[PDB]
Scaffold this active site. Sequence first.
Site, PDB file in Angstrom:
ATOM      1  N   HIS A  61      53.813  18.853 -22.190  1.00 42.65           N
ATOM      2  CA  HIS A  61      53.990  17.385 -22.255  1.00 42.65           C
ATOM      3  C   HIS A  61      52.784  16.702 -22.012  1.00 42.65           C
ATOM      4  O   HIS A  61      52.403  15.739 -22.696  1.00 42.65           O
ATOM      5  CB  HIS A  61      55.307  16.686 -21.554  1.00 42.65           C
ATOM      6  CG  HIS A  61      56.590  17.536 -21.943  1.00 42.65           C
ATOM      7  ND1 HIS A  61      57.304  18.268 -21.116  1.00 42.65           N
ATOM      8  CD2 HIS A  61      57.269  17.452 -23.374  1.00 42.65           C
ATOM      9  CE1 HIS A  61      58.177  18.777 -21.829  1.00 42.65           C
ATOM     10  NE2 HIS A  61      58.240  18.228 -22.892  1.00 42.65           N
ATOM     11  N   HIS A  91      48.735  12.679 -13.967  1.00 37.93           N
ATOM     12  CA  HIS A  91      48.601  13.077 -15.213  1.00 37.93           C
ATOM     13  C   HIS A  91      48.232  11.854 -16.039  1.00 37.93           C
ATOM     14  O   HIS A  91      48.425  10.585 -15.693  1.00 37.93           O
ATOM     15  CB  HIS A  91      49.827  13.558 -15.805  1.00 37.93           C
ATOM     16  CG  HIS A  91      51.200  12.764 -15.748  1.00 37.93           C
ATOM     17  ND1 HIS A  91      51.868  12.289 -14.774  1.00 37.93           N
ATOM     18  CD2 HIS A  91      51.436  12.028 -16.967  1.00 37.93           C
ATOM     19  CE1 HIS A  91      52.748  11.709 -15.035  1.00 37.93           C
ATOM     20  NE2 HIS A  91      52.600  11.170 -16.321  1.00 37.93           N
ATOM     21  N   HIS A  93      48.822  10.021 -20.318  1.00 36.79           N
ATOM     22  CA  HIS A  93      49.256   9.815 -21.723  1.00 36.79           C
ATOM     23  C   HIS A  93      48.008   9.277 -22.407  1.00 36.79           C
ATOM     24  O   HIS A  93      47.325   8.483 -22.072  1.00 36.79           O
ATOM     25  CB  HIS A  93      50.543   8.904 -21.599  1.00 36.79           C
ATOM     26  CG  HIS A  93      51.511   9.352 -20.628  1.00 36.79           C
ATOM     27  ND1 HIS A  93      52.567  10.070 -21.097  1.00 36.79           N
ATOM     28  CD2 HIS A  93      51.596   9.087 -19.492  1.00 36.79           C
ATOM     29  CE1 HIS A  93      53.422  10.308 -19.972  1.00 36.79           C
ATOM     30  NE2 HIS A  93      52.663   9.803 -18.892  1.00 36.79           N
ATOM     31  N   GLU A 103      51.159   3.938 -22.280  1.00 32.67           N
ATOM     32  CA  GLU A 103      52.711   3.542 -22.186  1.00 32.67           C
ATOM     33  C   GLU A 103      52.822   2.187 -22.111  1.00 32.67           C
ATOM     34  O   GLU A 103      53.466   1.476 -22.754  1.00 32.67           O
ATOM     35  CB  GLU A 103      53.267   4.334 -21.232  1.00 32.67           C
ATOM     36  CG  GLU A 103      53.048   5.942 -21.635  1.00 32.67           C
ATOM     37  CD  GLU A 103      54.166   6.885 -21.004  1.00 32.67           C
ATOM     38  OE1 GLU A 103      54.249   6.994 -19.747  1.00 32.67           O
ATOM     39  OE2 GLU A 103      54.835   7.611 -21.714  1.00 32.67           O
ATOM     40  N   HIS A 116      48.781   8.080 -14.606  1.00 30.93           N
ATOM     41  CA  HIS A 116      49.626   7.928 -13.700  1.00 30.93           C
ATOM     42  C   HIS A 116      49.531   8.735 -12.503  1.00 30.93           C
ATOM     43  O   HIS A 116      49.667   9.939 -12.446  1.00 30.93           O
ATOM     44  CB  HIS A 116      51.203   8.285 -14.207  1.00 30.93           C
ATOM     45  CG  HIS A 116      51.504   7.395 -15.286  1.00 30.93           C
ATOM     46  ND1 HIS A 116      52.856   7.707 -16.304  1.00 30.93           N
ATOM     47  CD2 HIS A 116      50.991   6.177 -15.620  1.00 30.93           C
ATOM     48  CE1 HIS A 116      52.536   6.777 -17.251  1.00 30.93           C
ATOM     49  NE2 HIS A 116      51.753   5.782 -16.852  1.00 30.93           N
ATOM     50  N   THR A 195      58.827   7.852 -17.312  1.00 30.75           N
ATOM     51  CA  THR A 195      58.535   7.647 -18.475  1.00 30.75           C
ATOM     52  C   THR A 195      58.817   8.790 -19.687  1.00 30.75           C
ATOM     53  O   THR A 195      58.819   8.738 -20.901  1.00 30.75           O
ATOM     54  CB  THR A 195      57.081   6.981 -18.960  1.00 30.75           C
ATOM     55  OG1 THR A 195      56.470   8.018 -18.669  1.00 30.75           O
ATOM     56  CG2 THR A 195      56.882   5.748 -18.277  1.00 30.75           C
TER      57      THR A 195
END
EC number: 4.2.1.1
Length: 257
Positions: A61, A91, A93, A103, A116, A195
């Site tokens: 992911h 990590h 996104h 996000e 994050h 999330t």
Amino acid sequence: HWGYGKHNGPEHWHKDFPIAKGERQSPVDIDTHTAKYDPSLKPLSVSYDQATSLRILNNGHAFNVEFDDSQDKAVLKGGPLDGTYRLIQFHFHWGSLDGQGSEHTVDKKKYAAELHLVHWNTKYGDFGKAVQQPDGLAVLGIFLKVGSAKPGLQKVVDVLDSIKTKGKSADFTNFDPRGLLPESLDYWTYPGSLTTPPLLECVTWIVLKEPISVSSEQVLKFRKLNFNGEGEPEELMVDNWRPAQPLKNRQIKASFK
């Protein structure tokens, strides 16, 4: 299983994780004009000098940089928080294009990526217990824009070829997460959730106002990662972001005027 595709993406998650339609879901749009300055909010205390990074993992992911959280070594305190929150992992996104990837949004603006830094409240003893509590986690969110390189990110970028596919990990010791922080610790805060599934409503979100800049080459290397495992069909790890969710009965507070 869940992911970010047409058939398993954010609009499907509620079928396995009904809390996806809950009262305190993340991320959200941060409407800067309606956030309220809260003069009683304390400065954040980010104490990362003794951080012990261990490993970097492609989990299918995102990629996680994991830390030793068996002692108070890298902790977040202050701000809206009561008590001590230990860093467990960070990590990102990110998007397929520089105009999407974050996000959280700010006045509907999307950033190229979002970092994050995930911390858990030590009064609950372990991370698995903490995610079952409304004040279990504190996540420090940092926007990334494309511009100049972030030197402190380069060691992460360097290692990504070693963890191209899902399930691969590599040793990642002696990484200093202070190199990922912007100059200012001015922030917005609100109660929300993870999330990604299981989407648990256990997070105090602390989203920094100031983005960091990373280079086009750095973000391009994120986009060479794979969602798939080795020997499976190649699907680039891009657009691993959940869109903004309804704010519902929440007020976003600002640490700054």
